Structure 1
Amino acid sequence: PVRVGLSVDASALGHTIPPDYTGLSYEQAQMANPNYFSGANTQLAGFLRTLGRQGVLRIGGNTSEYTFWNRHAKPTAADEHLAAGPDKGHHAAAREVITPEAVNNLSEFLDKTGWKLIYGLNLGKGTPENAADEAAYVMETIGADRLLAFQLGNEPDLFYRNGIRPASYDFAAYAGDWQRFFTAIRKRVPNAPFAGPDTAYNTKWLVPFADKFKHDVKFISSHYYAEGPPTDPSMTIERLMKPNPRLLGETAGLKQVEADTGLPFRLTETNSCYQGGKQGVSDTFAAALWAGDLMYQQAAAGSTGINFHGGGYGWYTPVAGTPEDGFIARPEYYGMLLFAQAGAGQLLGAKLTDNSAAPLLTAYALRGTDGRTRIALFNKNLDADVEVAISGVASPSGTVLRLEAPRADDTTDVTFGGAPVGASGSWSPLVQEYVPGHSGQFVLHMRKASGALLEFA
């Protein structure tokens, strides 16, 4: 093993993680099926509760430009069996209708989970008046306490690429659209909250959006995929475990926006690989390590939260399935589960030394809201075991829950705390293990391509 030092500093205060930090993002097309986001969907509701007692459900995505609210519509027989996976971006999605029934059923789903809602409106192809009407029904049925924000279009900077607007569409044009929709909506719903611009940090769209619309939104909404442009070497597990300088830069950009406008930021759509994911990467244990680490990295940067995109049986979905067939936890879910068990609190200094031979090991220390110290570690080195000598924690007893699979590319065999997640998100730890050492010096071994959560008495 590579022998590294980890030094915890209870005085090096970072950010406080909010209790609604975790979340999921889904395609708005899924709302065509009123059985999906329903009070009767107890299995899916159970998977969300396990991910956190508070969190945020975001509904939007490319399909939000192809979904059309109608106050008189009833779902058809095909609609009652629709499971809309992440949009693969290769062409126009099918047209779908959203019904009062689906909205009513969403409000019951949110009551069963305890989660809040970010809800997409159709700015790509709809009308301001139909958006106002949809926003009104959502506000009537869901309420201002569970409705966090509406968003007016998804990835407007990509409308051109995907046939929704002409090549010439730019931020100026988008700001005109945004204003027309904001104005119509606010007439019907004077207390409507908004977030935007619902894409990746950039200077042509995100920076001017925040300057112009800072008094009209509650927070900035940004997207992030670890996969870079279509021209890069395609994503591998190896690459996914390494730092992404684009991420660090886009995160800084978001912090500067915050400094300039007062607006906080949330990562409203993210996953490993775009266009639904890549088989052999996105659907593997490696995605658990990537996702768990990402949650922590963005939290330490001052992010208000996250929403991992998914649905259907897409390669990157945290939860897979249907109401007819049932739901299961995919490998990525286990990384979010580790964050769920750690809980909220305030991040602390945790400096790694002696680690140039194991450079993809990361570590985050947290003072829990219950007063206990926790450490989340991700050994993302694919070929190096580690031995971590831990100082700066005094406690009579540490325990470890391990995040494991037998290989980094496994599509199954994933456990946390020595147990799989069962039906309806059911999980409890079955193997807990004391961390050797004592107050001021603890010693933790970790295999290559594993994770761990340490909780100190």
Structure 2
Amino acid sequence: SPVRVGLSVDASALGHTIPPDYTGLSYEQAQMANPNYFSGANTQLAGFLRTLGRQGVLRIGGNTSEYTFWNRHAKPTAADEHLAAGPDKGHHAAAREVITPEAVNNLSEFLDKTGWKLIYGLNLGKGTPENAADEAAYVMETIGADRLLAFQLGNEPDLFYRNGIRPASYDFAAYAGDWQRFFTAIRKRVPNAPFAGPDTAYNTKWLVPFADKFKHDVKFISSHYYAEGPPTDPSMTIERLMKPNPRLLGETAGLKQVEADTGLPFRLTETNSCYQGGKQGVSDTFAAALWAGDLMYQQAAAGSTGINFHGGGYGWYTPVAGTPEDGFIARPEYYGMLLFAQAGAGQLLGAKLTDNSAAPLLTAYALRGTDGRTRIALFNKNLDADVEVAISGVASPSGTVLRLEAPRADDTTDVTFGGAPVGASGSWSPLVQEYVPGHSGQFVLHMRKASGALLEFAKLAAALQH
């Protein structure tokens, strides 16, 4: 028998607005060594991004951003034509890579084909301020002010003290000194250069001090989140992934604090399920779709203005896997992002769950879409409990449900949304879409254990609309 829970939607309780560019992906800067990857000719990957959102943000950074060196005078053949750069595993220094001018030109084409904007890492870890200024100049010229959202000066500088990038004495004050030096050099050469930071791994104590010190220098504040790690740890499981943890609560409190105290927006610029490259049997499973879709909404409800899921290559947690030579595919996590994409932009509404102590990992989010239709995204992250959700406060003659499903929570394949897999180049259309009748604003939705659902409700009295 299902656990019977109540979901009370309150259209009068307006929450945060979900902007059109909320969604996003993050990749290693090392990928810029291969001009064929972010390229106008990479129609497959561009298609996968367009399906994730008409608007969205591509963030380039990560550990390899300290090991990539822009060279305006590179031979064009300094490029690695085959490289599909997977997430850096953070055990040792990454291989040094050159970024060539054509890689930046090709990145511009890719942004034009996808319609996405760019967050671009600069090498504060090991590069010179002069070269950062030159790199920034080329990127601004080539990408353009319209599509360049922000430069970030270093990746996860809160870990420099332990990963060899800086001495063990490095702290916020030292980083602030580094940041000012690079900022000044860049702005001299590029007076309209936009910035975000601190792009920290975890240390929320850096957020408000960064925002306070550099308030007039930045567009938004950024930090990272990984739910689990290290991947070799047997405590890091699918069941754990379905639950909140102190790191998440700290990041959530951190983003709320920086927004309240400074008025600057926050973006989660690098996130995924398990750090140091992800975990086989967790990150590459259907559970990751539930995790990712839920995280997108939870962060938005808290005030986050966007997200960037890290990935690349065939990494265990990558949303899209593949190469320009062999083709690209949607991994299970992609389907959670797809649910969000299909729901679309709009404004969150109050949605409170009750009678849910026996199904505590069920989450639900209500949205008034830009088109005026109510949507509800539900994630039944309870691995062992089916639920029956009594939904109130939605006035609509009827709703349709698209299901996010796999036959087992640990499946690495067999994932469908709306009864269909995603195909080549991000192709997707729903093939199974069940009708839910309502009365007096009330609906009853069953969900099997370890599943998700997107409900879309019809307008009132609109059967004859054009």
Report the TM-score, using the length of structure 2 for normalisation. 0.96
Equivalent residue, structure 2, for 1:52: 53
* SS of residue in 2 equivalent to 1:39: coil
Equivalent residue, structure 1, for 2:322: 321
Tell whether the 8 Å contact from 1:200 to 1:206 is kept in structure 2 after alignment.
Answer: no
After TM superposition, give the deviation of residue 231 of structure 1 in Å: 11
Tell whether the 8 Å contact from 1:13 to 1:346 is kept in structure 2 after alignment.
Answer: yes
* SS of residue in 1 equivalent to 2:37: coil
Tell whether the 8 Å contact from 1:436 to 1:444 is kept in structure 2 after alignment.
Answer: no
CA shift digits 1:201-227 (9 cap, x unpaired): 535422321111111111001101111
* SS of residue in 2 equivalent to 1:435: strand
* SS of residue in 2 equivalent to 1:160: helix
Cα pair distance change 1:90/1:229, threshold 3 Å = closer
CA shift digits 1:114-156 (9 cap, x unpaired): 0000000000000000000000000000110100000000011
Tell whether the 8 Å contact from 1:201 to 1:254 is kept in structure 2 after alignment.
Answer: no
CA shift digits 1:420-457 (9 cap, x unpaired): 0000000000011011443422111100000000000x
Tell whether the 8 Å contact from 2:79 to 2:100 is kept in structure 1 after alignment.
Answer: no
After TM superposition, give the deviation of residue 358 of structure 1 in Å: 0.6
| C-alpha distance in structure 1 between counterparts of 2:183 and 2:56, whole Å | 26
- More displaced, 244-253 or 409-418? 244-253
* SS of residue in 2 equivalent to 1:248: helix
Cα pair distance change 1:420/1:363, threshold 3 Å = same
CA shift digits 1:371-417 (9 cap, x unpaired): 00000000000000011111111111110000000000000000000
Q: Which runs of 5+ in 1 are unaligned?
A: none
Tell whether the 8 Å contact from 1:132 to 1:185 is kept in structure 2 after alignment.
Answer: yes
| C-alpha distance in structure 1 between counterparts of 2:250 and 2:397, whole Å | 41
Cα pair distance change 1:75/1:284, threshold 3 Å = farther
After TM superposition, give the deviation of residue 258 of structure 1 in Å: 1.6
| C-alpha distance in structure 1 between counterparts of 2:326 and 2:269, whole Å | 28
After TM superposition, give the deviation of residue 233 of structure 1 in Å: 6.3
* SS of residue in 2 equivalent to 1:110: helix
Tell whether the 8 Å contact from 1:151 to 1:198 is kept in structure 2 after alignment.
Answer: yes
* SS of residue in 2 equivalent to 1:101: helix
- More displaced, 246-255 or 372-381? 246-255
| C-alpha distance in structure 2 between counterparts of 1:349 and 1:181, whole Å | 43
* SS of residue in 2 equivalent to 1:79: coil
Tell whether the 8 Å contact from 2:294 to 2:363 is kept in structure 1 after alignment.
Answer: yes
Cα pair distance change 1:231/1:100, threshold 3 Å = closer
Cα pair distance change 1:205/1:397, threshold 3 Å = same
| C-alpha distance in structure 2 between counterparts of 1:77 and 1:64, whole Å | 17
Cα pair distance change 1:78/1:128, threshold 3 Å = closer
After TM superposition, give the deviation of residue 254 of structure 1 in Å: 1.7
| C-alpha distance in structure 1 between counterparts of 2:69 and 2:241, whole Å | 37
Tell whether the 8 Å contact from 2:159 to 2:201 is kept in structure 1 after alignment.
Answer: no
After TM superposition, give the deviation of residue 364 of structure 1 in Å: 0.4
* SS of residue in 1 equivalent to 2:22: coil
After TM superposition, give the deviation of residue 230 of structure 1 in Å: 8.8
| C-alpha distance in structure 2 between counterparts of 1:129 and 1:47, whole Å | 36
Tell whether the 8 Å contact from 1:435 to 1:442 is kept in structure 2 after alignment.
Answer: yes
| C-alpha distance in structure 1 between counterparts of 2:317 and 2:304, whole Å | 22
After TM superposition, give the deviation of residue 260 of structure 1 in Å: 1.7
Equivalent residue, structure 1, for 2:62: 61
Tell whether the 8 Å contact from 2:405 to 2:416 is kept in structure 1 after alignment.
Answer: yes
Q: Please tell me the root mean square deviation across aligned C-alpha atoms, in Å.
A: 1.4
| C-alpha distance in structure 1 between counterparts of 2:76 and 2:432, whole Å | 46
After TM superposition, give the deviation of residue 248 of structure 1 in Å: 2.2
Identity %: 100
Tell whether the 8 Å contact from 1:295 to 1:306 is kept in structure 2 after alignment.
Answer: yes
Tell whether the 8 Å contact from 1:32 to 1:75 is kept in structure 2 after alignment.
Answer: no
After TM superposition, give the deviation of residue 365 of structure 1 in Å: 0.4
Cα pair distance change 1:204/1:451, threshold 3 Å = closer
> 4+ residue stretches of structure 1 with deviation over 6 A?
229-233
After TM superposition, give the deviation of residue 234 of structure 1 in Å: 2.8
After TM superposition, give the deviation of residue 78 of structure 1 in Å: 6.9
Cα pair distance change 1:91/1:380, threshold 3 Å = same
Equivalent residue, structure 2, for 1:237: 238
| C-alpha distance in structure 1 between counterparts of 2:350 and 2:450, whole Å | 23
Tell whether the 8 Å contact from 1:32 to 1:102 is kept in structure 2 after alignment.
Answer: yes
Equivalent residue, structure 2, for 1:3: 4
Tell whether the 8 Å contact from 1:300 to 1:347 is kept in structure 2 after alignment.
Answer: yes
Equivalent residue, structure 1, for 2:407: 406
Tell whether the 8 Å contact from 1:17 to 1:345 is kept in structure 2 after alignment.
Answer: yes
| C-alpha distance in structure 1 between counterparts of 2:132 and 2:28, whole Å | 17
Cα pair distance change 1:135/1:362, threshold 3 Å = same
* SS of residue in 2 equivalent to 1:76: helix
Tell whether the 8 Å contact from 2:8 to 2:352 is kept in structure 1 after alignment.
Answer: yes
Matches within 5 A, 1:60-139: 60-76=61-77, 79-139=80-140
CA shift digits 1:294-338 (9 cap, x unpaired): 000000011010000000000000000000000000000000000
* SS of residue in 2 equivalent to 1:454: strand
- More displaced, 217-226 or 388-397? 388-397
* SS of residue in 2 equivalent to 1:159: helix
* SS of residue in 2 equivalent to 1:161: helix
Cα pair distance change 1:415/1:88, threshold 3 Å = same
CA shift digits 1:175-216 (9 cap, x unpaired): 111111001000110000000000145354223211111111
- More displaced, 5-14 or 325-334? 5-14
| C-alpha distance in structure 1 between counterparts of 2:230 and 2:317, whole Å | 18
After TM superposition, give the deviation of residue 87 of structure 1 in Å: 0.1
Tell whether the 8 Å contact from 1:34 to 1:75 is kept in structure 2 after alignment.
Answer: no
* SS of residue in 2 equivalent to 1:179: helix
After TM superposition, give the deviation of residue 247 of structure 1 in Å: 1.3
| C-alpha distance in structure 2 between counterparts of 1:65 and 1:243, whole Å | 31
* SS of residue in 2 equivalent to 1:378: strand
After TM superposition, give the deviation of residue 76 of structure 1 in Å: 3.4
After TM superposition, give the deviation of residue 259 of structure 1 in Å: 1.8
After TM superposition, give the deviation of residue 6 of structure 1 in Å: 0.8
* SS of residue in 2 equivalent to 1:409: coil
Tell whether the 8 Å contact from 1:201 to 1:253 is kept in structure 2 after alignment.
Answer: no
Tell whether the 8 Å contact from 1:258 to 1:264 is kept in structure 2 after alignment.
Answer: yes
Tell whether the 8 Å contact from 2:231 to 2:279 is kept in structure 1 after alignment.
Answer: no
| C-alpha distance in structure 1 between counterparts of 2:347 and 2:263, whole Å | 21
* SS of residue in 1 equivalent to 2:261: helix
Tell whether the 8 Å contact from 1:33 to 1:79 is kept in structure 2 after alignment.
Answer: yes
Matches within 5 A, 1:196-235: 196-200=197-201, 202-227=203-228, 234-235=235-236
| C-alpha distance in structure 2 between counterparts of 1:24 and 1:133, whole Å | 25
Report the TM-score, using the length of structure 1 for normalisation. 0.98
| C-alpha distance in structure 2 between counterparts of 1:34 and 1:135, whole Å | 18
CA shift digits 1:25-51 (9 cap, x unpaired): 000000000000000000000000000
Tell whether the 8 Å contact from 2:231 to 2:276 is kept in structure 1 after alignment.
Answer: no
